Design an enzyme around this catalytic site. Structure first.
Site, PDB file in Angstrom:
ATOM      1  N   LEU A  19      -1.889 -10.408  38.831  1.00 25.56           N
ATOM      2  CA  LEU A  19      -0.768 -11.007  38.098  1.00 25.56           C
ATOM      3  C   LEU A  19       0.390 -11.414  39.027  1.00 25.56           C
ATOM      4  O   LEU A  19       0.818 -12.571  38.996  1.00 25.56           O
ATOM      5  CB  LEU A  19      -0.295 -10.073  36.972  1.00 25.56           C
ATOM      6  N   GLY A  20       0.895 -10.493  39.852  1.00 22.37           N
ATOM      7  CA  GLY A  20       1.944 -10.854  40.811  1.00 22.37           C
ATOM      8  C   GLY A  20       2.393  -9.776  41.785  1.00 22.37           C
ATOM      9  O   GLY A  20       2.398  -8.585  41.457  1.00 22.37           O
ATOM     10  N   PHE A  24       7.441  -3.854  44.373  1.00 14.77           N
ATOM     11  CA  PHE A  24       6.803  -2.525  44.417  1.00 14.77           C
ATOM     12  C   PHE A  24       5.308  -2.559  44.770  1.00 14.77           C
ATOM     13  O   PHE A  24       4.821  -1.656  45.464  1.00 14.77           O
ATOM     14  CB  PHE A  24       7.047  -1.738  43.111  1.00 14.77           C
ATOM     15  N   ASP A 134      17.968   0.216  34.919  1.00 16.41           N
ATOM     16  CA  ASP A 134      17.320  -0.903  35.617  1.00 16.41           C
ATOM     17  C   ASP A 134      17.032  -2.091  34.702  1.00 16.41           C
ATOM     18  O   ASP A 134      16.030  -2.783  34.843  1.00 16.41           O
ATOM     19  CB  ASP A 134      16.028  -0.439  36.298  1.00 16.41           C
TER      20      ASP A 134
HETATM   21  C1  R09 Z   1       3.210   2.323  35.496  1.00 17.09           C
HETATM   22  O1  R09 Z   1       2.795   1.534  34.374  1.00 17.09           O
HETATM   23  C2  R09 Z   1       2.945   0.186  34.534  1.00 17.09           C
HETATM   24  C3  R09 Z   1       1.817  -0.576  34.808  1.00 17.09           C
HETATM   25  C4  R09 Z   1       1.927  -1.951  34.958  1.00 17.09           C
HETATM   26  C5  R09 Z   1       3.159  -2.582  34.833  1.00 17.09           C
HETATM   27  C6  R09 Z   1       3.228  -3.962  34.991  1.00 17.09           C
HETATM   28  C7  R09 Z   1       4.439  -4.616  34.861  1.00 17.09           C
HETATM   29  C8  R09 Z   1       4.535  -5.936  35.002  1.00 17.09           C
HETATM   30  C9  R09 Z   1       4.069  -6.910  34.194  1.00 17.09           C
HETATM   31  C10 R09 Z   1       3.322  -6.862  33.070  1.00 17.09           C
HETATM   32  C11 R09 Z   1       2.601  -8.012  32.724  1.00 17.09           C
HETATM   33  C12 R09 Z   1       1.790  -8.040  31.600  1.00 17.09           C
HETATM   34  N1  R09 Z   1       1.687  -6.916  30.789  1.00 17.09           N
HETATM   35  C13 R09 Z   1       2.412  -5.767  31.112  1.00 17.09           C
HETATM   36  C14 R09 Z   1       3.216  -5.738  32.243  1.00 17.09           C
HETATM   37  N2  R09 Z   1       4.419  -8.083  34.718  1.00 17.09           N
HETATM   38  C15 R09 Z   1       5.112  -7.823  35.808  1.00 17.09           C
HETATM   39  C16 R09 Z   1       5.623  -8.758  36.609  1.00 17.09           C
HETATM   40  C17 R09 Z   1       4.835  -9.167  37.683  1.00 17.09           C
HETATM   41  C18 R09 Z   1       5.302 -10.129  38.569  1.00 17.09           C
HETATM   42  C19 R09 Z   1       6.563 -10.699  38.392  1.00 17.09           C
HETATM   43  S1  R09 Z   1       7.134 -11.935  39.558  1.00 17.09           S
HETATM   44  C20 R09 Z   1       8.065 -13.184  38.687  1.00 17.09           C
HETATM   45  O2  R09 Z   1       8.029 -11.271  40.611  1.00 17.09           O
HETATM   46  O3  R09 Z   1       5.941 -12.584  40.267  1.00 17.09           O
HETATM   47  C21 R09 Z   1       7.361 -10.294  37.317  1.00 17.09           C
HETATM   48  C22 R09 Z   1       6.897  -9.323  36.421  1.00 17.09           C
HETATM   49  C23 R09 Z   1       7.706  -8.924  35.355  1.00 17.09           C
HETATM   50  N3  R09 Z   1       5.196  -6.506  36.001  1.00 17.09           N
HETATM   51  C24 R09 Z   1       5.914  -5.868  37.145  1.00 17.09           C
HETATM   52  C25 R09 Z   1       5.577  -3.859  34.574  1.00 17.09           C
HETATM   53  C26 R09 Z   1       5.517  -2.471  34.419  1.00 17.09           C
HETATM   54  C27 R09 Z   1       4.296  -1.828  34.549  1.00 17.09           C
HETATM   55  C28 R09 Z   1       4.192  -0.442  34.393  1.00 17.09           C
END
Ligand code: R09
Length: 286
Positions: A19-20, A24, A134
């Site tokens: 995803l990205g 972190f 946050d």
């Molecule tokens: C410890 O448990 C977790 C596990 C996975 C997590 C993933 C994210 C997350 C998610 C997410 C996406 C789809 N469904 C749920 C979450 N999307 C992101 C995400 C990824 C990349 C980017 S970017 C614009 O810097 O490329 C932005 C976001 C919000 N995160 C950090 C956010 C919190 C998460 C917490």
């Protein structure tokens, strides 16, 4: 223990995508072998069993917080040297990524729904004595139904380091105990909320143009931020900001109080956000 040390996670779960990479680490898209349900996962390799504690505290937090507007924890495994944590997949992505794809801010009716829904989340969190610390548009995730999900408790969990006479104590030390301990530190989320609303209106938070080291100082001595072009926005919005962004946390209101403000007290449907998520999805297709 919500972390099953028994049971390998490849019995239940199956990886399908990335995803990205933001800061972190990496974030995988995961599928359930039995039910077929989608989840978002973090697989962490652990430098230290000491540090690990931070992620376990996050999991405990997530497992205690059952609320509509906070992501469901679908599973937690520690297997091999790795740590697996599965979250409810939110297919609308983060609001800031939404603003990047549409190449604009949110409209006032959209902000209202987000603001209203965040207030309900915070009000729930604060009654369980949990502080987010946050809040930013990048941690507000969207479902396709047009509802938010609060997502990352990595800072909040680090601060439950507090889990681990003073006649001579200095004033500024006294205040950083009552501020950082209880009735006062709930209000920090309230401030951040105010700032997240300006980010949503203007794409970038106040002081974005300044280098990161200098913002801290700017936040300290500056007047509270206001919307750049107050022509564009309703009086209810500006007044909401005016009172949410009080530098004096003692007078700054709680979430429960702000749910009685006209800017959000008449918000009965999430339609405006259902519409924004649909525009985003369509833009992603091009
Ligand atoms: C410890 O448990 C977790 C596990 C996975 C997590 C993933 C994210 C997350 C998610 C997410 C996406 C789809 N469904 C749920 C979450 N999307 C992101 C995400 C990824 C990349 C980017 S970017 C614009 O810097 O490329 C932005 C976001 C919000 N995160 C950090 C956010 C919190 C998460 C917490």
């Amino acid at each position: 223990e919500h972390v099953r040390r028994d049971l390998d996670p490849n019995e239940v779960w199956e990886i399908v995508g990335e995803l990205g990479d933001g800061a972190f680490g990496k974030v995988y898209k995961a599928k359930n072998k039995e039910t077929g349900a989608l989840a978002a996962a973090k697989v962490i390799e652990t430098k230290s069993e000491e540090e690990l504690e931070d992620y376990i505290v996050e999991i405990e937090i997530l497992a205690t917080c059952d609320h509509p507007y906070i992501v469901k924890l679908l599973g937690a495994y520690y297997h091999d040297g790795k740590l697996w944590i599965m979250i409810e997949f939110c297919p609308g992505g983060a609001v800031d990524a939404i603003m990047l794809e549409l190449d604009r801010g949110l409209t006032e009716p959209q902000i209202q729904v987000v603001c209203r829904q965040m207030l309900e989340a915070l009000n729930f969190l604060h009654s369980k004595r949990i502080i987010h610390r946050d809040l930013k548009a990048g941690n507000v995730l969207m479902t396709l139904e047009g509802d938010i999900r609060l997502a990352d408790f990595g800072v909040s969990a680090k601060n439950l380091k507090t889990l681990q006479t003073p006649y001579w104590m200095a004033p500024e030390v006294v205040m950083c105990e009552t501020m950082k301990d209880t009735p006062y530190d709930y209000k920090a989320d309230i401030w951040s909320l105010g700032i997240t609303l300006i980010e949503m209106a203007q794409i970038e938070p106040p002081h974005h143009e300044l280098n990161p080291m200098r913002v801290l100082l700017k936040i300290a001595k500056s007047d509270p931020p206001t919307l750049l072009t107050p022509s564009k926005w309703s009086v209810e919005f500006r007044d909401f900001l005016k009172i949410a962004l009080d530098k004096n946390p003692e007078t700054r209101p709680s979430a429960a109080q702000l749910l009685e403000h006209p800017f959000v007290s008449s918000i009965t449907s999430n339609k405006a956000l259902r519409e924004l998520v649909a525009e985003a999805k369509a833009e992603v297709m091009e």
